[PDB]
Design a protein around this nucleic acid. Sequence first.
RNA 1: UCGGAGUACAAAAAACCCUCCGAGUGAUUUUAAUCUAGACAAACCAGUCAAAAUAACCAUAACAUCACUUAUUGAUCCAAAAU
Lengths: 23, 52, 55, 288, 151, 95, 162, 110
Amino acid sequence: PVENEAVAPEFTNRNPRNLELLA
Amino acid sequence: SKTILVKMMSQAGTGFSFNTKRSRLREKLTLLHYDPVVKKKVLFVEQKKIRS
Amino acid sequence: IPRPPKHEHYPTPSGWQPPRDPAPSLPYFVRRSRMHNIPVYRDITHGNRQMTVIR
Amino acid sequence: GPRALDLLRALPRVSLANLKPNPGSRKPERRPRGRRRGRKCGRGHKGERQRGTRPRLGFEGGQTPFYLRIPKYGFNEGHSFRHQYQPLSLNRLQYLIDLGRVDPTQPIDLTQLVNGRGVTIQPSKRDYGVQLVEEGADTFKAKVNIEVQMASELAIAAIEKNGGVVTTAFYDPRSLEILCKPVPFFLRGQPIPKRMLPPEALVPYYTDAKNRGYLADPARFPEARLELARKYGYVLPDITKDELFKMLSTRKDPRQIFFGLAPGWVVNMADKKILKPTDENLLKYYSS
Amino acid sequence: EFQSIYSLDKLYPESRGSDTAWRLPDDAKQANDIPVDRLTISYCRSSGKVNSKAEVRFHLASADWIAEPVRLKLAVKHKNRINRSGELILTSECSRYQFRNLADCLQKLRDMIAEASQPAKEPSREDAELRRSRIENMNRERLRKKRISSA
Amino acid sequence: VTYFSSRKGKRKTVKAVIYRFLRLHSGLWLRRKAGYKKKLWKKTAARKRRLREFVFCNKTQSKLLDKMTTSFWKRRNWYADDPYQKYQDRTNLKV
Amino acid sequence: TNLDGHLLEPDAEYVHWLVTNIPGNRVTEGQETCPYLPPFPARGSGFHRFAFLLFKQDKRIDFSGDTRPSPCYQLAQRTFHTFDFYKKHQDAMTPAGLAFFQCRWDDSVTRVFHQLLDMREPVFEFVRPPPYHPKQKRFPHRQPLRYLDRYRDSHEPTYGIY
Amino acid sequence: SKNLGGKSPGKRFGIKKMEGHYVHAGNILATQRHFRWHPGAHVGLGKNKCLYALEEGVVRYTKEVYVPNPSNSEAVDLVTRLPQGAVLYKTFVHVVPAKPEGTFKLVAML
RNA sequence: UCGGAGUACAAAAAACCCUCCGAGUGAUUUUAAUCUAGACAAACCAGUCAAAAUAACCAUAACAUCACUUAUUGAUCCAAAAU
Ligand SMILES: [Mg+2]
Ligand SMILES: [Mg+2]
Ligand SMILES: [Mg+2]
Ligand SMILES: [Mg+2]
Ligand SMILES: [Mg+2]
Ligand SMILES: [Mg+2]
Ligand SMILES: [Mg+2]
Ligand SMILES: [Mg+2]
Ligand SMILES: [Mg+2]
Ligand SMILES: [Mg+2]
Ligand SMILES: [Mg+2]
Ligand SMILES: [Mg+2]
Ligand SMILES: [Mg+2]
């Protein structure tokens, strides 16, 4: 298949402001 | 200083009564309550006297 | 109890499946139920002892 | 196989002199005799317990009982008059059809279900028949002329998808007993009675085409079937041009209990004959 | 053959034949909306919660049973649920029965078709979660308002 | 409780239990909180809600009520539009 | 550098625009090692960070391992580690400039995923842990009738044998 | 005789969850008659001075400075009468959250 | 019968015809809702807290407050209202 198609469904966002901005 | 128990009926049309304590030496009571039928602040007036 | 009708495709929509025409060469035979079902059941004892019974 | 039979050859004769029950099958009784089981014999010291004068179960020693301090609320109020309907899964119906208990080639009735042992109806326990549930509607692949008392909307949709006929009818307790056990009724020696109409609480249910009521207007059946098919996204089968259209469209009169038989007939099973009344008053009463 | 006073024929004399209830009134419904035969329906029975994922896929561009403005409105509004191949996809997960799941998918499809067909859509927007977005856009264009030529 | 009746020789049941209790087929007994209609003007809204809520019974009370009632009240009932038909059975009980 | 948004490796980062050997201020004159790629944050996970790192160098650094091809549309090739980059070229460059912005998904990210990256747009969501419930009791004492609904798998009626 | 009414059961006013105990949301950490333990992070205060955890985590107890509400006249008077170098200290109970707020899970590729 | 302090010095509980205070409610307006996780306490009956979500008020609170605030209260059944 496509080499870039890999997803790793456990996505981790390391941004400390991510949840603060998502409220 | 004896109080009184009075049943108030809503004036929003729907039949909804609640009991409250009032002083005997007071006039006919009239307050603002919450009517669950219409979910709004409704004027309630004293309708009946139940307990002394 | 009537014998089950023959179907053109197995397993049946209800999941029932008849036994093989020749018996297996194993030295044991699990006879079918009178309703033509496998005699494997579950049993409960004391309210927490769970068991499986092959008859 | 049964090696016990070959083992029995060496063993002596099996007679009444050598018989033993299974171990643990009969727990031995114990009597208040001896040093251990005597001396108050498991009753205790003085009081009411040793003299056998205890109060009743609900008594708590003069305290207001738990089963009496709880306020009365209607939980079983009118329980003996609520209508009860034995559920019949589409999965169970398919299982019966596959195993041959009921034949789809004939109109399926409560009598047929009882004969095939798929359901058990106890009219004395206020059962009013069989209702249809949708617990196995995904894998239902049979075309039958089902005849129940209540039917779920999804069960009706599942049956119409395969191309059957669902009809919900009412049975008063007497006719329900007769349907469940026709042979005892035929040995009872009484004429077949008329089928009582449903009460006012059940008339709307049985006069609506959405529930496939047996008293409903047949002109509104195709509209309801089309609405059902459009809701559940399946094509409505061409039932009219089917080979078994007669079997699919066979129906019972609202005053009729059995198929073919009529109220007032006496089934003499010993001589294999049917006696039909001819009096004008009797015929009017039975057909009214 | 037995007939009684409460029989269906006597109750409703307009329809007396035994085959009047099994007709197909094709004239009553001639629009023939939602051609289910032209929709790709797939089932996934996930058990271990026990539920039947129902997926309904259909090419929005090739769907000729709805008008061009309706197709354009679905393309504009529901682009979040449109595959890269142009296949609009509908999801149902609520009920354990694939019948009910397909019914939910078809109801969502009908609702979208009606919403795009009605011209009186005022595009009303919620305010509980939109005030934050409005404030953020306000403060972002407050910085964007710089006017210097480039490129 | 009459363990042996004088007419039929059967076991009788006390009607108070069935008048103020409900038994689910799983064995649980459902009851109303005592005092839920008494002096509602004197009680807080939270207390009134707690009194209005239905409550269960523990093992001792359940066994007592089972002793008082007969086998007709422990049967499986299929009522028309039964409010408690969903609660008649117990699911995911790991014991 | 795209700090957050790598689909596979949590500890890795993406490249978007690498220009090297910039003479003074004229960045356009300097050679570009990595062609510019527009931000492509996933639809579910929002507010990614993109950092502009500026390094001042004394010598003219020349390399071949960090060079990217002309298309440079492969996420496998666009995998970066600023720590490794600075460890490799630590002697010459020194960081002196910083410019970072937050970025969330919009209507152009799907076009970037489809036309440029040639893939299917991934969609995420912020799921929450299931509510905690104690071990179910055989006889729940004084519990509401809704106690049995806390341990129900589905709100459907199952008829086991009927 | 002359003394009456002295009998009354204890109210069980005490501490329910100690330091290091893993609590869930809504668990009553400690109940009290007067303010002995003050709530801190992720610990809510009921109408009857009881302390309940608001998040699932680990209970901790700390000694921290006490800045009262400026509308509290009694505490403000106490503060304004405190000497120059004096700072009030109180025992606060905290809940340190353990599980993350949530997770980003892939649902579908569109 | 209910509550506070000591007995019972530091988690909880703990008795006496032990030593002392009290309660069987007042005043005022902010007239204080529904539904539901998880908990305290408890032989049972009863008593207590409470996150999230809902309709009305600031579009930033609603736990009614004070009198040591803790006690100011009574189960079923049965009778009455307007349910
Ligand atoms: Mg058994
Ligand atoms: Mg013995
Ligand atoms: Mg004996
Ligand atoms: Mg002995
Ligand atoms: Mg002796
Ligand atoms: Mg004694
Ligand atoms: Mg003796
Ligand atoms: Mg007494
Ligand atoms: Mg039965
Ligand atoms: Mg004391
Ligand atoms: Mg005591
Ligand atoms: Mg405890
Ligand atoms: Mg809240």
